[PDB]
């Protein structure tokens, strides 16, 4: 399928408490592979996917120094935005960036992007065309004209169309062209009391990777989305994820309901019912 190289940047000021916190995290298809954190004892670019241990000490030395230079830019950004938004030097503020490219199965670019946020709100973004910016408020307007003047979009474009793409392919190499590691869900149903002529059937999907999954409850072929309770998918802490969906049903009609689990690791979706222990 498609593939992605994304970098997620965070700089957060903390007046009084010391210099801005600065973080760079890299992702190949949602999988974190490098990370920098300026609050570490020794601030360097560190491998986070063991397949990254393939790169030579130069790589790390040179991306570390890149992080340090980025930290300076964002630290100055923080100061600049206090001017733009007339904000106090004593408050805590956050800058975020998501930057990256998606290339196709053929290895061609399908989309370059770079998005900025300030205190959690969109600030400015590069358009589909890789040529123009979309500002979200008056302050971002000032940024947009400066960058248009400097032609920054042409320079970003070159990164996205080239550098980004080539390393994406390169990282895909090392981490295997389309690393679909896969643990299919182990599913089961539990049974729980309700205001007592009612019962709760809870369908569990456990130990699965990756996070994408779908559980449904069916009554005579129909999907009960109204009345289903769902939790957000969550990490077990060991690399896999968990989810459940529950349904409140009349006492004694448990066998009228079926749970369905859909996941790229499943040859065929799972079908299951409440089983009274034989």
């Amino acid at each position: 399928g498609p593939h992605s190289l994304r970098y997620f940047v965070t700089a957060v000021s903390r007046p009084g408490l010391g210099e801005p916190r600065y973080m760079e995290v890299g992702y190949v298809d949602d999988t974190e592979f490098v990370r920098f954190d300026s609050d570490a004892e020794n601030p360097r670019y560190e491998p986070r996917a063991r397949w990254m241990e393939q790169e030579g000490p130069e790589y790390w030395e040179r991306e570390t120094q890149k992080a340090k230079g980025n930290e300076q830019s964002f630290r100055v950004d923080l100061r600049t935005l206090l001017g733009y938004y007339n904000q106090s030097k004593g408050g805590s503020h956050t800058i975020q960036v998501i930057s990256g490219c998606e290339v196709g199965s053929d290895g061609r670019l399908l989309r370059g992007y770079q998005q900025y946020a300030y205190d959690g709100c969109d600030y400015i973004a590069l358009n589909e065309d890789l040529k123009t910016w979309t500002a979200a408020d008056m302050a971002a307007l000032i940024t947009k004209h400066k960058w248009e003047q400097a032609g920054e979009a042409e320079r970003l474009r070159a990164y996205l169309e080239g550098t980004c793409v080539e390393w994406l392919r390169r990282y895909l190499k090392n981490g295997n062209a389309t690393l679909l590691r896969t643990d299919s869900p182990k599913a089961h149903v539990t049974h729980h009391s309700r205001p007592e002529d009612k019962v709760t059937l809870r369908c569990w999907a456990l130990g699965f990777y990756p996070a994408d999954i779908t559980l449904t409850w069916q009554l005579n072929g129909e999907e009960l989305i109204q009345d289903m309770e769902l939790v957000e998918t969550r990490p077990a802490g060991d690399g896999t994820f968990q989810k459940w969906a529950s349904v409140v049903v009349p006492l004694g009609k448990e066998q009228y309901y079926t749970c369905h689990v859909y996941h790229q690791g499943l040859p065929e979706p799972l079908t299951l019912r409440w089983e009274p222990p034989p």
């Binding site: 970098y7 991306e63 890149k66 830019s73 930057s99 770079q114 600030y123 400097a150 550098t163 390393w167």
Partner: peptide, 8 residues
């Protein structure tokens, strides 16, 4: 690798 960022 990441982009070399300039200032806003």
């Amino acid at each position: 690798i990441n982009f070399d960022f300039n200032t806003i």
